[PDB]
């Protein structure tokens with residue numbers, strides 16, 4: 573049974589190409605009208621923090637829910653750093669490769685729907701993750717190209733990250749991947 577997913581969306585991009593709108597349209601998640609309306613004590617996905625999501629976070633997702641902010645990647649750092657404090661259990665995703673047509677093959681920077689599916693998979697909701705990904709023709713391939721990493725991540729093993737990113741200093745590497753989008 574899929575955990576309850578809640579999304580606050582910054583209405584910036586055109587919604588016909590936004591993956592969060594599609595999640596909501598099919599009932600995998602529900603939109604809320606503000607960040608304050610997101611459930612307190614829930615897991616919130618947050619690419620700006622250094623603490624990776626682990627399988628044991630499942631217990632929180634089941635009981636409080638899973639929250640996300642949908643915005644442009646150009647605004648993502650500013651939004652997450654300035655508007656969510658204390659209210660949530662903030663977790664980045666472990667390092668994964670994007671499968672969407674825009675950023676295919678590139679690390680860490682995922683679409684909202686890929687992030688939701690990754691979170692679900694890691695927390696043991698593999699069937700739900702696939703149901704979500706099947707909303708796009710390229711969706712299931714996200715698990716395929718990340719299969720070896722996801723298997724370790726779902727088993728609580730984060731050792732793939734340094735080899736995949738190719739740096740010991742993962743923190744700096746992640747900060748730079750996002751800096752590229754912030755400044756471009």
Ligand SMILES: C[Se@@+](CC[C@H](N)C(=O)O)C[C@H]1O[C@@H](n2cnc3c(N)ncnc32)[C@H](O)[C@@H]1O
Pocket residue numbers: 585589590591592617618619640641642643644645648663664665680681682683684685687688
């Ligand atoms: C900035 Se949003 C851009 C949406 C895109 N135009 C689309 O239509 O799907 C992607 C959101 O997905 C989650 N997310 C993505 N990657 C990660 C990550 N690596 N760690 C943690 N969370 C991640 C964050 O909630 C993001 O805010």
